[PDB]
Amino acid sequence: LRNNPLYHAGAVAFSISAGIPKVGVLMESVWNMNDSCRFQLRSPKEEEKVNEEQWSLREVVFVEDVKNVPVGKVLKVDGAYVAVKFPGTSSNTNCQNSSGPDADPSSLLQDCRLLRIDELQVVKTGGTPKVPDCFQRTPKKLCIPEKTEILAVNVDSKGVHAVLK
Amino acid sequence: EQWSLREVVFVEDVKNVPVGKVLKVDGAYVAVKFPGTSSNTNCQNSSGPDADPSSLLQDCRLLRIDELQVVKTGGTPKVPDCFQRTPKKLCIPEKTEILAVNVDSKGVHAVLKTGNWVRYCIFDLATGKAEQENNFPTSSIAFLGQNERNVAIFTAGQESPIILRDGNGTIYPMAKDCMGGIRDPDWLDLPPISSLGMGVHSLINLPANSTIKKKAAVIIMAVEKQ
């Protein structure tokens, strides 16, 4: 879909409140980084509600956009419209095994979304557009002034702090 | 051939009014299986349980909901038939006697007697009423002639001219005036006609560049020898 959010429901993130790092699964699609969204904390339906908090994305750091960036196979094209089978479109979560030859062919209709061609973006051999990782995997050099001696250093979210002689 | 719809009569609005069964609804978009949408005319037997599920997709059109109309238990909207299957009465004026009648696409043509008066009448089939009625400029007795049973109003067929006959067997020389009335009789100096033939004939024997049109009325006159 062309109208992709910044992060999708299901992305795993952590928030550091009260010094407790809390790990939670994003419950809704994020459209702007200055908003606040609900996260279900993860290690007859009250237990499902008991572990949601709403947090702002400043506080939250996404580890993974695990899922829910939707890629489907175009099963038909017609005029301005298209039929596309995406993973997870079936409201019947209990139909995870109808991949047999006896799959009621109405189920394949139930599985596919009907959209307009202009609402879709073609996925090329490079995969879906990756959200850039927020972990600086490799060491990055800092611009140390010349002819200076470093007496002490430390770190914080604010950046690097150092005493220079 | 390219035909002007004015001259065409549709016999039966046969087929090609496609009813589809809605197979899936997705917000404002829908998938509908309509008959004859499979470009593979050779898939007429894939109605088995092993029917490749992709074939069902190939068979159904994708549209928006606003482009569709629900078919109710009365079927598709019938185009009204152009053939008046049952007899329809015409609005005949009271106290009139009918001397002759004939037909054409223009409607019904009849000669009506009213006491000592004689009138020529054209009837509209939509309303059933006379579209125009005119008294003859000649004496009514002269039209009634020696034998009123001889009165007639012959036509060549469709799109035809009209030939009246009086009670003497004479062709009555009709013509409209510029007021919509009847001009003085432009006499023909003709003997009586015992019988007259009727029909329309093609003139395709003509060259395509002819000024004479590709149609004509053919009239055969059994003229009496005086």
Author numbering:
A (entry chain B): 536 to 578, 640 to 761
B (entry chain C): 649 to 874
Tell me what the authors wrote about this structure, in their words.
Here, we used genetic screens to identify the HECT-family protein ubiquitin protein ligase E3 component n-recognin 5 (UBR5) as the E3 ubiquitin ligase that governs agonist-induced degradation of numerous NRs and characterized these interactions biochemically and structurally. We next structurally interrogated functional domains in the context of full-length UBR5, which is expressed predominantly as a 310 kDa polypeptide product in humans. The N-terminal region of UBR5 arranges into a seven-bladed β-propeller, which shows weak homology to a regulator of chromosome condensation 1 (RCC1)-like domain (RLD). Following the RLD, a large helical region forms the core scaffold of UBR5.
We determined the structure of full-length UBR5 by cryo-EM, which, following further classification and refinement, reached ~3.9 Å resolution. Intriguingly, 2D class averages and the reconstructed 3D volumes showed a ring-like structure with distinguishable symmetric features. Size-exclusion multi-angle light scattering (SEC-MALS) identified a main species with a molecular weight of 1.385 MDa, consistent with a tetrameric assembly. The overall architecture of UBR5 is a closed and twisted ring with dihedral (D2) symmetry, held together by two distinct dimerization interfaces. A second dimerization interface holds together two halves of the ring and is markedly more flexible. Despite a lower local resolution in this region, the EM density map is consistent with the structure prediction from AlphaFold, showing tandem small beta bundles (SBBs), spatially separated but swapped in their primary sequences. In the context of the native tetramer, four SBBs link across the halves of the ring. In the structure of the UBR5 tetramer, the four HECT domains protrude towards the center of the ring cavity, separated by ~71 Å (within the same side of the ring) or ~91 Å (across opposite sides of the ring). Our 2D class averages consistently showed a blurry density in the middle of the ring. In the context of the full-length UBR5 tetramer, RARA/RXRA binds proximal to one UBR5 protomer, placing the NR within the ring, adjacent to the HECT domain of its dimerization partner and therefore also in the vicinity of the UBA domains.
